Design a binder for this molecule. Sequence first.
Ligand code: CLA
Ligand code: CLA
Ligand code: CLA
Ligand code: CLA
Ligand SMILES: CC1=C(C#C/C(C)=C/C=C\C(C)=C\C=C\C=C(C)\C=C\C=C(/C)C#CC2=C(C)C[C@@H](O)CC2(C)C)C(C)(C)C[C@H](O)C1
Ligand SMILES: CC1=C(C#C/C(C)=C/C=C/C(C)=C/C=C/C=C(C)/C=C/C=C(C)/C=C/C2=C(C)CCCC2(C)C)C(C)(C)C[C@H](O)C1
Ligand SMILES: CC1=C(C/C=C(\C)CCC[C@H](C)CCC[C@H](C)CCCC(C)C)C(=O)c2ccccc2C1=O
Ligand code: SF4
Lengths: 68, 170, 742, 166, 42
Amino acid sequence: VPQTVAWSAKTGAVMVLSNILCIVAGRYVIQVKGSFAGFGLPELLASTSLGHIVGSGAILGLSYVGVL
Amino acid sequence: DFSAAVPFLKRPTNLDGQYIGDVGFDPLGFSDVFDLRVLREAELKHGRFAMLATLGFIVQELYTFPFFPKMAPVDAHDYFVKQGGGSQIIFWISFVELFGVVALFETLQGKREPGDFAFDPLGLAKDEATLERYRLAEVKHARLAMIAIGGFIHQYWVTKQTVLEQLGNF
Amino acid sequence: KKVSITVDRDPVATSFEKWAQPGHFSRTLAKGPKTTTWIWNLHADVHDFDSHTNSLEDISRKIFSAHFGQLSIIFLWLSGMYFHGARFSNYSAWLSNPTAVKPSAQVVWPIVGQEILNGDVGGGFQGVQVTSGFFQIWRASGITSEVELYWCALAGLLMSGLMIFAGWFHYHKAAPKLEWFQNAESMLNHHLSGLLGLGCLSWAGHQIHISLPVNKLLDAGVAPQEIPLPHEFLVNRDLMAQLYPSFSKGLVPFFTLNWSEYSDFLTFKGGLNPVTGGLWLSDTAHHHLALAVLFIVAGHMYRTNWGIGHSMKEILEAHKGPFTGEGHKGLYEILTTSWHAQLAINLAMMGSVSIIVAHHMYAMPPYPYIATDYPTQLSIFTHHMWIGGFCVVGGAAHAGIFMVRDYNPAQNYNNLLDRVIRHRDAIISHLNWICIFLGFHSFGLYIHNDTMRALGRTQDMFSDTAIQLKPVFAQWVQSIHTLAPGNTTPNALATASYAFGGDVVAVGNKVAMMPISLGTADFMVHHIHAFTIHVTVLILLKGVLFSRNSRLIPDKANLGFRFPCDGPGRGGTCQSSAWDSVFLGLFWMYNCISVVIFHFSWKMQSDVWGTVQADGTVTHITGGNFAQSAITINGWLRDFLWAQASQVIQSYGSALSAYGLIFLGAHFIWAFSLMFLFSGRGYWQELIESIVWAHNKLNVAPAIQPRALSITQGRAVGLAHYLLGGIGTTWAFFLARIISVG
Amino acid sequence: MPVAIPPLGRPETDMFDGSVPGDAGFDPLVISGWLDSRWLREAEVKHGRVAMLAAAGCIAQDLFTFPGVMSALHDAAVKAGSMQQMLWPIAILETISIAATIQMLQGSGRAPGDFGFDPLGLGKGAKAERMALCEIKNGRLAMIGFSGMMHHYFITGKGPIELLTS
Amino acid sequence: MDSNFLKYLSTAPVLFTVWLSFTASFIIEANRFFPDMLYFPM
Ligand code: CLA
Ligand code: CLA
Ligand code: CLA
Ligand code: CLA
Ligand SMILES: CC1=C(C#C/C(C)=C/C=C\C(C)=C\C=C\C=C(C)\C=C\C=C(/C)C#CC2=C(C)C[C@@H](O)CC2(C)C)C(C)(C)C[C@H](O)C1
Ligand SMILES: CC1=C(C#C/C(C)=C/C=C/C(C)=C/C=C/C=C(C)/C=C/C=C(C)/C=C/C2=C(C)CCCC2(C)C)C(C)(C)C[C@H](O)C1
Ligand SMILES: CC1=C(C/C=C(\C)CCC[C@H](C)CCC[C@H](C)CCCC(C)C)C(=O)c2ccccc2C1=O
Ligand code: SF4
């Protein structure tokens, strides 16, 4: 079984970083919606949902490879 | 506008008060899809069965015919399944229910009220106002006995005691 | 918003008037019969909604409500199976002794001696043995009593009533508008995330919370009556944690991404459960949970009222290259306007999925005690193979219907459809050549082997003891999949299936699964399969691509999808429609699926299924005769057809005698079909003229003038009785053989 | 008009027209602009009334118990079957509230949180609007207050007033 | 009873199915109460 870790501040840091990266990426690449003008609740929900998806994948992968 | 019984619900459009006992109570909207004549015939039939059932639980446990063994009414269903009286009662109810089918077809043609079987041999309703008053009384007793018969049967299933002994202790 | 709910209220009055007017839906048919042909026409075009009206909205409403009606029928059927399992089955005795009680959920009444069909099925029970696999499904679901089966039957009946009410409501009371139906993105989002995703998630919930503890107690040897009820597994976390200790940790490991804590009930074991011979239920629970996550993620792809999401029209129009002109442009309009194109795609996909189900369900048995239930395995493989073949040919048929009816060349200029039509001759010619090549170099190997074995030259045959045709690629793939645990799937304990290689998983002295080796005979029969599939594709694709016109008939689209001919001219134009191509492709599908199921039956009986005895040797049902006999047609005739039909022809006077009767009756219906297939309409019309004279002589000629069946109806009736006869013959033969010997 | 936070201003939605009771100009995520107004108002009033009953319950049960014997009370009353017997009438009342909220979203004359119930007559006339404000303010405070008493219980296994006096 | 429903019940497939089921039920009940009648007893 691949090693997963208990919740810590590192897990929170990775999740927060992935969420913020996905929020900025969603600001830049979403075609149909000063830089945060037009920023609405569905776009925030989509970006934070991708942020949990990317953060979960990154946390599981870094726990797999030993970076924790 | 709104229902007379439930003040925060709108009045169902097909509940205009033509049927005695109407307080505009239909939150699931059964009258919006189904024929109200059929629903009222079903309500009165279910209720009259339940009224006779509750009176039967009271009398049939107070008194029992000498030509029958003594047992509880719920066990009496299972006994008369095998003895053959229950088949006789089911047969005669079915026989009357064939003319009930004919009466329901007459109701759907608009030639008969949804509860009118023209059965008043003792002449108890003389004039109109008495008939509306007894209609409201019958509808209320029908609904009340429909709740009460389920109460009787389920409480016997849990306590294994009849109504009148359950009244004496707890 | 753009995606919204638009509904018309009370569009069609609920009335019995049109029930008394047969043919009301068609202006041609509403005039009433004058000939008997009308009657056939009344049953032939009735659910062909687009030919009754041109309004897409009314067609869509009819389709939605008919789908509700089909769902009601399916729910009634399921409720029937649950009820007949509850009341007329030996399911409790089977739960106590799965390896020795034959499943049976049908009991016949004694009338004319048919009570002999109530065979001694074990468990103190007499009935007809059933092979649908419902007992194994209910054991996998954790159903331990017949009371639960009664409640399941009630749930099925209630859902059937709900579906039929929904059909009446959504046609006759509140019919959605055309704009509601034309939301492909919203429908895909809801059906991917809500239907498949939440369905997988809730079934994973049932598997984790109900199926795993009950089946763990069953495999440990606990009697079904002493197993706790499922709600006790729900509320007593200590009882759950006795079997899986990670349940003591609750839902904290899920939300904190400490998922490995759940490794005791979410596993990646692979292989099979040694006690039951089925897949590990923990593996299935992780599987359905992972599928739920993937499906819910996939259900957020497509654009809806809010700005996020993909637009499928943009995706299609962006994918275009130098070989393909305008590319995938115009396909979104086709697939949002033509119901027949969607039916073509979905029927093709559902058929391919059913075929995949048959392969993957024999090879990795998913239910407890289903692997050693050989009649169930053979029945479900054959059944889902047949359903798959029928649905694939139906996808081709409704593709041809789209091409004749709904195709518009103005909206299809230089896109992929237009370019496919414009090089149809190259496509069909290359497919024709590859079909002839496959036929020669696959079937002529069998003919060559027949001749060599008949001429006494065994060293000149294609066999493993002779000139060899080794299936090296499939053997290499088998070696890879055997070497995969620990190397390319390092966290899997065992192989995905033991059919690729490994140990002999045996349950109750019967082989659940063992390696399925591939030799010269397997090479020849897989290339026979490739030949038959390519020829079926040739027939169906030639019919679809030449449905509108050809060099023979330049105005074929004006004649329609379904016409008998364009007359004896041009040399003869018989069977020129796309419908007739579907008619021939159904025969070739029958041939293909028949060879596939024969290969399956012989290979499993010869090399996989059997009894395990002392020193670990496996005695197979036919003793390994496939390697030397399946290389000739004589070997298929003698060692498979002649040898294994002994059980169905000696079934008279036993419980399996119904299979012998159905065997004879299916041979009869198949032969009866050849009267319709080989003959023509004019003979029967003149014979009917003479019979009409006979009835006219006695003044008993009918007012509805009797006519011979139409040419298309002659073909359709011959094909229907042919398929029924052949499939019924294989049905009776398979079932009698595998019930007797397995 | 009350501007809760001056840099972000007052959201331009169907809500914050000023007719809705209890508006402070506070909706920074602008959830009102994406979900219906009456649904959110009904949700707020129902959450507030349930939390008011909950906080009053925590205080009153810690003061006194009905004759005959927090989260442990939920577990022990489920084991007693009390919670099912309290789920059943609440379930009935909530199925009629399903009906009422469906009609209100369909556009009937019912205001959100209004169940037509005023036996004392304290609402009739000019009071109710202010009372509505009072209700919603108390409702919001209840959602804070109970949220203390449970999590505090999670720390101590102790009731909030009994924690306060100890 | 609705005349249109009766007219639907009078259609050829419904009446065919009902009449053939009725005939089949006669044959089945006759063979249930008097089985194995290879011959007319004389
Ligand atoms: C910090 C970043 C980070 C790191 C280090 C990792 C690291 C890892 N991830 Mg991970 N991941 C990340 C971010 C990260 N991920 C993000 C952001 C996501 C999105 C949510 C994912 C989603 C993800 C999934 C869903 C999975 C992983 C898995 C893995 C492990 C891969 C094991 C392996 O060899 O692959 C396997 C290598 C292969 C070659 C296998 C092939 C896989 C399939 C069967 C083939 C499908 C391709 C198909 C044929 C189509 C190709 C045809 C084409 C021509 C069209 C590895 C430890 C896997 C895992 O945990 O396994 C235990 C796994 O299932 N990751
Ligand atoms: C999450 C929402 C959702 C779900 C679950 C479905 C589900 C379904 N749709 Mg669908 N649909 C949706 C949204 C949804 N749709 C939307 C938004 C649109 C408009 C764009 C459509 C438009 C649409 C059309 C036009 C058609 C369907 C059809 C179907 C059925 C496919 C056949 C099948 O597999 O049935 C078997 C699967 C089942 C789950 C059987 C049970 C059926 C009931 C209705 C499920 C209800 C579940 C309920 C929501 C939650 C209760 C479960 C539990 C908590 C008690 C299936 C029931 C087809 C059909 O057959 O219509 C009748 C069809 O023709 N849908
Ligand atoms: C999702 C499934 C599906 C759906 C909804 C449709 C829908 C449709 N198809 Mg299609 N089709 C399908 C699957 C489907 N098909 C498959 C799988 C095939 C391949 C066999 C075909 C082959 C096909 C052809 C070749 C044609 C259609 C046609 C039609 C249209 C009218 C059908 C009609 O009125 O028949 C009314 C219903 C009947 C006549 C009942 C048929 C009864 C069958 C033949 C016998 C059943 C025997 C039974 C199973 C076992 C009996 C044994 C017992 C006696 C012992 C309609 C749009 C026709 C059309 O004109 O389209 C424009 C047309 O020409 N389809
Ligand atoms: C056993 C009966 C039988 C046989 C042998 C064939 C043979 C053939 N059919 Mg056919 N068909 C049949 C029954 C049969 N059909 C029936 C019952 C139907 C009714 C629905 C159809 C409907 C049908 C359609 C609709 C199509 C075919 C097609 C084909 C061809 C496939 C290409 C191929 O395999 O080339 C290889 C040839 C063979 C396997 C034939 C046997 C030759 C063997 C190998 C020995 C050769 C020895 C040599 C010639 C000896 C010379 C001796 C000298 C004295 C002459 C082929 C000519 C397809 C076609 O023509 O396109 C490709 C096509 O589209 N058939
Ligand atoms: C419709 C209608 C009617 C009505 C009505 C009803 C049912 C009236 C309901 C009135 C209520 C429930 C009023 C408000 C309660 C507010 C609370 C509990 C909020 C927070 C408490 C906190 C934070 C606390 C506390 C604390 C304390 C003290 C102690 C410790 O624990 C610690 C802590 C510091 C946390 C009637 C029938 C009358 C008729 C009328 O014509 C109209
Ligand atoms: C199987 C079996 C048998 C049996 C049996 C039978 C007959 C079993 C049970 C039957 C029935 C009818 C049960 C339920 C009855 C009524 C209920 C629940 C009413 C609730 C009313 C409420 C909540 C009112 C609420 C309300 C209130 C307060 C006022 C406002 C309105 C409303 C909101 C609606 C035998 C013995 C016959 C035969 C055999 O041997 C075995
Ligand atoms: C036999 C045959 C017929 C004759 C079939 C007749 C016309 C159809 C018979 C249908 C019957 C009347 C319906 C069902 C028959 C039942 C077994 C008994 C009759 C029931 C009556 C009450 C109608 C064709 O018309 C035909 C047309 C084209 C190619 C081949 C053929 C062909 O082979
Ligand atoms: S034989 Fe029949 S199908 Fe062929 S051309 Fe003549 S009429 Fe048409």
